[PDB]
Design a protein around this ligand. Structure first.
Ligand SMILES: O=C(O)CNC(=O)C(=O)O
Ligand SMILES: [Mg+2]
Ligand code: NI
Ligand SMILES: [Zn+2]
Length: 331
């Protein structure tokens, strides 16, 4: 069995290997990359996402979100307070202001220490889930707006034609912006490209050990667990690496820098934080190996998780028994 310790693997495809996206995902899996839940892909030196980032300041962040924490430094939840719209240029200036800018630090490890010590005492502002793309239309390799769609994959694998679409989303981050512990909708893959700016640190639990993280989370967040048998789908709970180590939960960590891709694999729980002003693009995708995970994915039916239109068909076809309850939670 490849990669039996479930380490995060880093790949360096050549320009020729970068042509066929599906093939390269299946190659990474042949080497055991999915066992970690997360892999890093460094593009060949000849590749670029677009020519420059000099003209993105007029993109609108319609609903910036202030991430307010509650709890203790290593075990907290966050809620998102809506703020007035602002452009990317306005947000960049805000991120770089004295109130929000990255503090002085020695290296990534020191900054990670500072994040876990101090995150809860501040409320950073995040642009999230902004439909759009920064890939040039002429970029033919690993262009996150030109991937094979999940609806087409389900049709190819299972024969059923379904409604829905699959487009990418932009994220604008700042120091301490935080992504809570979660798997993807319907335990899909994700891919994330860091277009510009400061890094993103990731934490990940191997898919084979995801239920260990869920059990800890039910212990640490006991009211939330009583409210919903899949409350991590709310995407609000944080647990630090120190707490995970104290409780014997298997995980790994890695820092993504600008110009790098990260792939998350089905049922790989992940969380993390941004180091400073940055812009990322991400999208969900499927492969044939996903189908079995989609069929078994938990679902939130309490009303909290609310998700895209296109998840309807996935639940309806892959999880017909759960469909009526889940749709009630959508309405
Ligand atoms: O840019 C981001 O914070 C969100 N990314 C993830 O959880 C992911 O791509 O799966
Ligand atoms: Mg612009
Ligand atoms: Ni994710
Ligand atoms: Zn719920």
């Amino acid at each position: 069995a490849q990669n039996p310790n479930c380490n995060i693997m880093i790949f360096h495809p050549t320009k020729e290997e970068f042509n066929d996206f599906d093939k390269y995902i299946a190659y990474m899996e042949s080497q055991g990359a999915h066992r970690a839940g997360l892999a890093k892909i460094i593009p060949p030196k000849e590749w670029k996402a677009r020519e420059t980032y000099d003209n993105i300041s007029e993109i609108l962040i319609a609903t910036p979100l202030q991430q307010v924490a509650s709890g203790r430094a290593g075990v907290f939840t966050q809620y998102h307070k809506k703020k007035k719209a602002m452009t990317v240029g306005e947000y960049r200036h805000l991120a770089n202001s004295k109130k929000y800018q990255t503090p002085p630090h020695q290296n990534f490890e020191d900054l990670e220490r500072k994040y876990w010590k101090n995150r809860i005492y501040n409320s950073p502002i995040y642009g999230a889930d902004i439909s759009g793309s920064l890939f040039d239309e002429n970029t033919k390799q690993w262009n996150l707006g030109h991937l094979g769609t999940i609806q087409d994959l389900l049709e190819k694998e299972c024969g059923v034609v379904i409604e829905g679409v699959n487009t990418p989303y932009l994220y604008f981050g700042m120091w301490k912006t935080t992504f809570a512990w979660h798997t993807e909708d319907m335990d899909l893959y994700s891919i994330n490209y860091l277009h510009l700016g400061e890094p993103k640190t990731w934490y990940v639990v191997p898919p084979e050990h995801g239920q260990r993280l869920e059990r800890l989370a039910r212990e640490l967040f006991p009211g939330s667990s009583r409210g919903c048998g899949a409350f991590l789908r709310h995407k609000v709970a944080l647990i630090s690496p120190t707490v995970l180590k104290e409780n014997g939960i298997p995980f790994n960590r890695i820092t993504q820098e600008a110009g790098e891709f990260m792939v998350t694999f089905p049922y790989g729980y992940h969380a993390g934080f941004n180091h400073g002003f940055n812009c990322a693009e991400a999208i969900n995708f499927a492969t044939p190996r996903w189908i079995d995970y989609g069929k078994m994915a938990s679902q939130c039916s309490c009303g909290e998780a609310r998700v895209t239109f296109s998840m309807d068909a996935f639940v309806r076809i892959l999880q017909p028994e759960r469909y009526d309850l889940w749709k009630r939670g959508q309405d």
